[PDB]
Design a protein around this motif. Sequence first.
Motif, mmCIF file in Angstrom:
data_model
loop_
_atom_site.group_PDB
_atom_site.id
_atom_site.type_symbol
_atom_site.label_atom_id
_atom_site.label_comp_id
_atom_site.label_asym_id
_atom_site.label_seq_id
_atom_site.Cartn_x
_atom_site.Cartn_y
_atom_site.Cartn_z
ATOM 1 N N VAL A 287 -17.242 -77.190 -13.825
ATOM 2 C CA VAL A 287 -15.992 -77.884 -13.471
ATOM 3 C C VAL A 287 -14.754 -76.891 -14.104
ATOM 4 N N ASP A 288 -14.821 -76.623 -15.140
ATOM 5 C CA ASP A 288 -13.571 -75.770 -15.577
ATOM 6 C C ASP A 288 -13.746 -74.636 -14.858
ATOM 7 N N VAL B 114 -11.991 -75.644 -11.024
ATOM 8 C CA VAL B 114 -10.617 -76.120 -11.109
ATOM 9 C C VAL B 114 -9.771 -74.846 -11.530
ATOM 10 N N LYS B 115 -10.184 -73.989 -12.201
ATOM 11 C CA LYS B 115 -9.424 -72.847 -12.542
ATOM 12 C C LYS B 115 -9.283 -72.303 -11.170
ATOM 13 N N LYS C 66 -8.744 -73.578 -8.720
ATOM 14 C CA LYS C 66 -8.007 -74.594 -7.637
ATOM 15 C C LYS C 66 -8.867 -75.234 -6.756
ATOM 16 N N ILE D 274 -15.344 -85.992 -16.770
ATOM 17 C CA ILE D 274 -14.560 -85.127 -16.020
ATOM 18 C C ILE D 274 -13.210 -85.857 -15.685
ATOM 19 N N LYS D 275 -13.018 -87.158 -15.473
ATOM 20 C CA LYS D 275 -11.696 -87.818 -15.340
ATOM 21 C C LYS D 275 -10.942 -88.008 -16.543
ATOM 22 N N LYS E 244 -11.224 -85.481 -18.691
ATOM 23 C CA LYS E 244 -10.502 -84.178 -19.050
ATOM 24 C C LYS E 244 -9.667 -83.949 -18.001
ATOM 25 N N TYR E 245 -9.780 -84.135 -16.628
ATOM 26 C CA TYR E 245 -8.905 -83.760 -15.568
ATOM 27 C C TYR E 245 -8.862 -84.981 -14.794
ATOM 28 N N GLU F 262 -6.580 -86.267 -12.881
ATOM 29 C CA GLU F 262 -5.912 -85.740 -11.485
ATOM 30 C C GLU F 262 -7.176 -85.219 -10.434
ATOM 31 N N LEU F 263 -7.978 -84.708 -11.021
ATOM 32 C CA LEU F 263 -9.097 -83.984 -10.118
ATOM 33 C C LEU F 263 -9.852 -84.946 -9.273
#
Lengths: 342, 347, 345, 344
Positions: free
Chosen positions: A107-108, A111-112, A114, A137-138, A140-141, A143-144
Motif C-alpha cells: 500500500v505504501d 500510494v507513493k 499516486k 489502511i483507512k 493510515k491513509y 483519504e485513500l
Amino acid sequence: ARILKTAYTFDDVLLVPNKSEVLPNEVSLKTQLTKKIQLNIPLMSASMDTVTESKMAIAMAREGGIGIIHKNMTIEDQAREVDRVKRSGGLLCGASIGVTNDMMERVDAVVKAKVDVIVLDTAHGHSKGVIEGVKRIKAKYPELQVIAGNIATPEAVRDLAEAGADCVKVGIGPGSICTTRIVAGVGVPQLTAVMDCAEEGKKLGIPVIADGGLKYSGDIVKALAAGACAAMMGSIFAGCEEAPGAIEIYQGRSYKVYRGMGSLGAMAFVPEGVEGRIAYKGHLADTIYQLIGGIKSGMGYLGAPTLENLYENANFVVQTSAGFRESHPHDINITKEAPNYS
Amino acid sequence: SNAMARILKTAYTFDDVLLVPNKSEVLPNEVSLKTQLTKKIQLNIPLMSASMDTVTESKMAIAMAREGGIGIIHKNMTIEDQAREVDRVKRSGGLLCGASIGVTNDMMERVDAVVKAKVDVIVLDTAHGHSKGVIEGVKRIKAKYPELQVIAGNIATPEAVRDLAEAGADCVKVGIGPGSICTTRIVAGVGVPQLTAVMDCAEEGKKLGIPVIADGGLKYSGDIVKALAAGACAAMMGSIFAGCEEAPGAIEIYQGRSYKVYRGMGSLGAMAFVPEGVEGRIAYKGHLADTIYQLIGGIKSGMGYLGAPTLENLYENANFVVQTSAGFRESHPHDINITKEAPNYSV
Amino acid sequence: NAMARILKTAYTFDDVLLVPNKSEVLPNEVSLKTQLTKKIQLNIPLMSASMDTVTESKMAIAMAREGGIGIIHKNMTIEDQAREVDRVKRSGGLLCGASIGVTNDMMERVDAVVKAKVDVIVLDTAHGHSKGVIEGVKRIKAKYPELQVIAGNIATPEAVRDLAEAGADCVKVGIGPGSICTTRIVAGVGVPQLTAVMDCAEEGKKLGIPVIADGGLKYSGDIVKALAAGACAAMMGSIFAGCEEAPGAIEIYQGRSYKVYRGMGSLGAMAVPEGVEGRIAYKGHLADTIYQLIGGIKSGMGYLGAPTLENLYENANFVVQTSAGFRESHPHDINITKEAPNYSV
Amino acid sequence: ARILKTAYTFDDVLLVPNKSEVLPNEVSLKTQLTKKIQLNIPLMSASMDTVTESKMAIAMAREGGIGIIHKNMTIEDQAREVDRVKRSGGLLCGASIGVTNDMMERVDAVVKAKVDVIVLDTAHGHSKGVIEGVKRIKAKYPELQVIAGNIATPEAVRDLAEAGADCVKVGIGPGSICTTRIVAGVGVPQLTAVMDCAEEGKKLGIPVIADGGLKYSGDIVKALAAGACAAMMGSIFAGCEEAPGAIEIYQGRSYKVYRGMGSLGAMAKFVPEGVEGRIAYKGHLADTIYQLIGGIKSGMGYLGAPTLENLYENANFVVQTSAGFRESHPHDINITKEAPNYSV
Ligand SMILES: C=C(C)c1cccc(C(C)(C)NC(=O)Nc2ccc(Cl)c(N[C@@H]3O[C@H](CO)[C@H](O)[C@H]3O)c2)c1
Ligand SMILES: C=C(C)c1cccc(C(C)(C)NC(=O)Nc2ccc(Cl)c(N[C@@H]3O[C@H](CO)[C@H](O)[C@H]3O)c2)c1
Ligand SMILES: C=C(C)c1cccc(C(C)(C)NC(=O)Nc2ccc(Cl)c(N[C@@H]3O[C@H](CO)[C@H](O)[C@H]3O)c2)c1
Ligand SMILES: C=C(C)c1cccc(C(C)(C)NC(=O)Nc2ccc(Cl)c(N[C@@H]3O[C@H](CO)[C@H](O)[C@H]3O)c2)c1
Ligand SMILES: O=c1[nH]cnc2c1ncn2[C@@H]1O[C@H](COP(=O)(O)O)[C@@H](O)[C@H]1O
Ligand SMILES: O=c1[nH]cnc2c1ncn2[C@@H]1O[C@H](COP(=O)(O)O)[C@@H](O)[C@H]1O
Ligand SMILES: O=c1[nH]cnc2c1ncn2[C@@H]1O[C@H](COP(=O)(O)O)[C@@H](O)[C@H]1O
Ligand SMILES: O=c1[nH]cnc2c1ncn2[C@@H]1O[C@H](COP(=O)(O)O)[C@@H](O)[C@H]1O
C-alpha cells in the motif's frame, strides 16, 4: 441448514422496456466508482496477471474506465506500473492489495506512486483479515479510496462499509475461469448477488461493483440496472492486444492466455481456477466501442438518459431455458461475423 | 374463487444448490474435519469408500484408514474371504474397518465372522433399508452384539431414519438412486434427489441423536461440502475412488489413456436378472492420497468461506440458495478453452 | 425512491401447451377470419415480416392472395416503396401494407404510399414505446385520420395503452424473439413472447385495439398459441424467408438449397448491430408453407373446440411444461427417416 | 386466456420410497382394464400398424396383457385378425374403431369375431363424434366393453363416462412418433394428464389408460402410481419380433419400422401429426416384458405395495430439476456393457 430462495444469474433474466424519450446516442454513462472517483464509462478491467498491467490500465483509462493493476509481482514492480499509468497524462489507476504480511508496505509503495484506488481483493472479502485490513489502511491513509472484496451478501456490504470501505466488489464464483463453486460448494448467482448487495449499499451510501460472469454487452446492462456502479471484466478484455501475453496462432486462429489467479499456474496446492486460452480480439478500443453501444441501446430501451434512474426504473422478468433459446438467435445458419455477438 | 392445486414438492440434488458465504474468522488451514460416524467411532476426515467390488477391498480400506477415513469391505465374496479382508486391515496397525452385510439366510454367520475379525462397524447394506427385513436384521444383530456398531441403509426419508433408529441402528445411510452407476430411478421410478434426501434425513437424525451418511452422487469436492453442510456426518463415494491405484481391478490402457472398471453392485456383472446398475470404465487416478488431498482441501476451503471451525458449526450456520441451469453454467468455468489439467476439476 | 425488482417469470411459446377442450367442430369447419384493425379483415391471420429478405411486392401479392397480408419494407427509396405498393394494389385490389420509420422524411414516405393506396402502414421501430413513435402516430392520424396505422414494436400493456391513446389502430408485439435478433443479448432487454402477447393482448382487448404477435414463431403450433393468447394476427420472417416469393436468389451449397435471411438491425441490412445475417433452407412456393400452417392452426382450433378465433381466445387454457415436458412434446427416441412437411429438426 | 399450472411428464418426477413389508417377488400385477376385464399384467400394445396385429396380440395376451388390433385394414381383415387371437385359447383381444361412416359395420364384424373390447380411437376423444359414437355402440351392444380416447382432462373423463365408456385412454401428444403438440400447439404433459384424469376416473368408477410417452420400466411405475389401470406402449414394443414389419439391417445394426398413425405414410395406406422412422430390433416380446415387469415389481417393493391399488393409495411424488434428472440417470461413467433394461 435452510434453503433461502432461488438466486439468478444474468442469463436468467431480461429487462422489461420502459417508455423512452431518449435515443441511445443521447444517454450518459458517467458513474461514481466511489464518492471521490468518477468514471466516464462504468467499466473496469480485472486485476489479473493475464488481464491488467499498465498497458491495459492506460488504455482502459483513456477509454473512460479504469484498470486495477494485479499484485502478482514485486511491490517495486507494481509501484512502477502504477507510476507509469499516472505519469501518462493524469489517468486514473488502481492496484490490487492482498491480506499479506507486507500489505502495508505494498500500500505504501502504490500510494507513493499516486494510485487513485486500491482494491483489497481476496477470495473471501467477508472475513476478519479483510475487515481489519481495511481498518488499518483507512487509519493510515484516511483519504485513500478503498474497494474491498469479494463478497456476495448484504451483511458483507454492511460489515465492510462499517470498516471504512468506500466501495465493495461483488462476486463469488461467477468468473469464466473460476471453480470456487465447484471445489468449495460456495457462491451466489451473480445477478441476485449484485441486486441484494446493491440494495444494501444504497441504504448505506456505498457503491457496489459487479465483478465476474459478464459475457455480452447486455449482461453489463443487467448488472448496472441491478444497481452496480460499475462492471469488472476479465474474459471480455483478456483477448485484447493491451492485456499481458503474446498472441499465439494455432490452425489459423489467434489466441491469448487467460487463467484464474487461483489457478495452479498463477499461484506458482488446491486451486480455485483454471488455465486456458481465449480468442484474440484485437485492440481494446474496438471491444469497448461495442460494449458501450449495447449499453447505450439498453438504456434507450429503458428510457434512462443517465445511470441513476436506470436502477430506479429497472423491472426484470425471469426467463426459462426455452426463453433463453428464444433470446439468442435461433434457427438460422449465421454466415457473417457480427462485432458484438458470437 | 380460490382454486385447488396439486401439492408436488421439488427436491434438489447437489448441482441445484450453492452455499452462501458467511462471515469468517477462520482460515481453511485452521478448520477441523473430525466427525462422529457413530457415538463410538470418530473419523479424522468425513470420507468413506463404497462397499463395492470395484472400490473397496483391504488395500483400499487400509489406505482410507491411514488417510483418516474408513473403507467398507464389500460382501461379494465368501464369508471367509470377507473375514480375511477385515482381519488384514485390522492387523495393519489397528486401523478402522467396516464390512457390508446383506439381508440373507446366512446373515448372522457373516456377522459372526467379521466380528471375530474385529470389524469396527458393519453396514447392513440393501437397496431398500426402510423394510421389514432390515429392521428385523438390525434388531437381531444388536440383540446378539449390543456394542457392535451398525450402519443401516439405504434410505431417503425421515420416517426411515426414525424406524431404523428405533430398531437399534447407530447410524443410517442415505441414498436411493444418486450413484453414478445406478439405474434404480430409471428402472423402478423411485428415489429422492440426494441433497434434499440428506437434508431431510439429517434433520430427523439430529433430533433423534443418530448420524446420517450421504452416500452416492458426489462428483467434486464442493459436493461433499454441500452434503456435510446439509447435516451428513460423512460422505460415501464410489466413483471418486474407483479409479485409484488402491481400488480393485487392473489398470487398463486404451488409445493412450488409462482406465479402471467401475460397476454397480446391482449390475448384471456384479450380480453374476433385472439389474439396477450399469458397468463401465472411468479414468485411472493414481494413488488415493492425491485424490484425498484435493477433496480435503476443497472441504477446508468451503468451511473457510462459511466461517466454520468444525463440521457441526458448518451445518449449524449453512444457508443454501437454489440455482437454475443457467446458474449452473455460470458456476462451472465457461467461455474458456481449458488447456492445462487442474488436479480438482475435469470436464 | 423506487428500486430494481424481479416481477415474475415470463414464458415463450416453447414453455406452454394448450389444454384440449370439448369440441363439436372439425378442423375443416373452423373460420380463420380476423380483424387486423376495425377497418381491415384478413381471411387468415398471417403476415409477412417487413424485411428486405422477406417481403417485397412478389411476397405481398402472394400473401394477400392466400388471404393474409405482406408489409413492404422501407429499405428502399420512397419512390420504389410507392411503386412496390402500387404493383400489389393493381393485382386485383389485394391488401397491402408498408413500413415507415421515425425519420426526417417520415411524412414524405407516408404521403407516397398513401398515394399508392396502401391499406395500412406500420410505424416500424425497435422501440415502439417511445416519444418518437407516439408523436409520429399522432402526426399521421392528424393528416390522414382514416389511414390505418400499426405501431410497434412493444412488449408491455403500458405501451399498448400509450399507443392506443396516440391513435394507433393496432399495436405490434415483439422485443427480442426474432430468429435473427440479438437485442436481448446486446442490450439486455425484452420479454419472452408468449407472455408479452398475453399481457399486451389483455390490455388491448380492454381498449378495443388489436395486437399482432411478431417474431419467434417456428412451427404452426406456435401460431395457435399466439392466437389463443389474444393476438389478432401472427407476423413471421423466418417461416417465409425461404419461400420462392421472398427476395433473394436461390443458393446451392453441397446439395442443399438456401436463401439469405438477415435482421434489419444487422450490419449488412444497415449498410451497433442488433441482428445477424445467415441463410435458411429454401422451402419452395409460399402456397405449400401456408397450407401446412393453416392446417396446423385448424387442427389446434379443432382440439380447442373453437369455430372462430374469438372463441379460441375466450376458452383457451395453457399449462407450463418443463424442459422434460418439451422433450416429450417433440418426437423422441425415434430415428426419423422420412420428411414430414410440417416438422423439421 | 390463462396459465393454469405447471404440468409434468414422467421424467419430471420420482416416487418416494415407503416402508415396505413386501418383496418384489410377492406383489400382484393384476388390474381391471374395465369392470368386466381383468389383466394379469397392466400392459397393452398400441393399436398401430407397426405395433399390433394378431401375432403381437396373441403374444401380449399370453404374457398376461392385451393387444389392440389396429384399424388400418379392411373390416374383414380386422375381424379375421381378432378371430385368430380368440381361437388361440380364448386370449383377450381388443380392436380399434374410428369415427367413420362404416363405424358400426366395423364394430359388428369384430363383435362377431368375439372381440373383448373395442377402442374408439381418435386424435381428440373429447369430441361430439366420439361421445355420440360411444352412445350408439352401447345402444346396440350394451355389454360390449368400450374404451374411448384419447383425452387429457377430467372433463373429458366425465363426458366420456356419461356417454357410456367403460374405460378412457389418456394421452394428447406424448407419443414418441407424435407431433400433435408441435403442429397444433395442444397437449398436456403425460404424468399430470394421467394423474388428473385417473383421479377423476376413480371418483366415477371408470379406469383410465396411460397411453404414450413411456420409455423405461420406471415410467410405467409412475403411470400406475398416478392411478392408471394400465399402460399402453408403441415404441417399447415396435422393435419386437412379434410386431409387424421385417427386420432390416443398416451398417451392422438391426431395425424395425415405426411410425405414427397420423404420419403421411400411415395415412396414405394432408397435414400430419406424426412422423415415420426406425427403432432398434429388440428380439422377442417375452424378453422385453420380463424386464418391464421386473422393474414394476421392484418399484412396488420400494413402495411397500402388494397390489396396484395399494401402490396408487400410498404413492408420493417429488419433482426433480434437470440437474436431478442428470443424477437419476447414470452419470460420469463410460458404459461398456449392455444392460437389458437401460439404454441411451
Ligand atoms: C478469487 C479466488 C477464488 C482466488 C484467488 C487467488 C487464490 C485463491 C485460492 C486458490 C488460494 N483460494 C483461496 O484463497 N481460498 C480461500 C477460501 C476460503 C477463505 Cl476464508 C480464504 N481466505 C483467504 O484469506 C484471506 C483472509 O482475509 C482472504 O479472506 C482469503 O483470500 C481463501 C482463490
Ligand atoms: C443398491 C442397489 C440398488 C442394488 C444393489 C445390489 C442389487 C440390487 C438389485 C438389482 C438386486 N435390486 C434390488 O435388490 N432391488 C430391490 C427393490 C425393492 C426391494 Cl423392496 C428390494 N428388497 C430387497 O430385499 C431386502 C429386504 O430387506 C432389501 O430391502 C432389498 O435388497 C430390492 C440393487
Ligand atoms: C428491430 C430491431 C431491433 C432493429 C431494426 C433495425 C435497426 C435496429 C438498430 C440496430 C438500428 N437498433 C436500434 O434501432 N436500437 C434502438 C435501441 C433503443 C432505442 Cl430507444 C431505439 N430507438 C429508435 O429511435 C426511434 C424513436 O422512436 C425508435 O424508438 C427506435 O427505432 C433504437 C434495430
Ligand atoms: C393420434 C393422432 C394424433 C392421429 C392419428 C391419425 C390421424 C391423425 C390426423 C393426422 C388425421 N390428425 C387428426 O385427426 N387431427 C385432429 C385434430 C382435431 C380434431 Cl377435433 C380432430 N377430430 C377428429 O375427427 C373425429 C371427430 O370425433 C375425432 O374427434 C378426431 O379423430 C382430429 C392424428
Ligand atoms: O482463479 C480464480 N478463482 C475464482 N475467481 C477468480 C479467479 N481469478 C479471478 N477471479 C475473479 O473472476 C473475475 C473475472 O471473471 P470473468 O470476467 O468472468 O472472466 C475477476 O475479476 C475476479 O473477481
Ligand atoms: O448397482 C447399483 N445400483 C444402485 N446403487 C448402487 C449400485 N451399486 C452401488 N450403489 C450405490 O451407489 C453408491 C456409489 O455412488 P457414486 O459415488 O455416485 O459412484 C454406493 O455407495 C451405493 O450406495
Ligand atoms: O435485426 C433485428 N433485430 C431484432 N429484431 C428484428 C431484426 N430484424 C427484424 N426483426 C424482428 O424479427 C421479426 C421476425 O422474426 P422471425 O419470424 O422469428 O424470424 C420481424 O418481424 C421483426 O419484428
Ligand atoms: O401419428 C400419431 N400422432 C400422435 N400420436 C400418435 C400417432 N400415432 C400413434 N399415436 C399415439 O402414440 C402412442 C404410442 O406412443 P409411444 O409409446 O410413446 O411410442 C399410441 O398408443 C397413440 O396413442
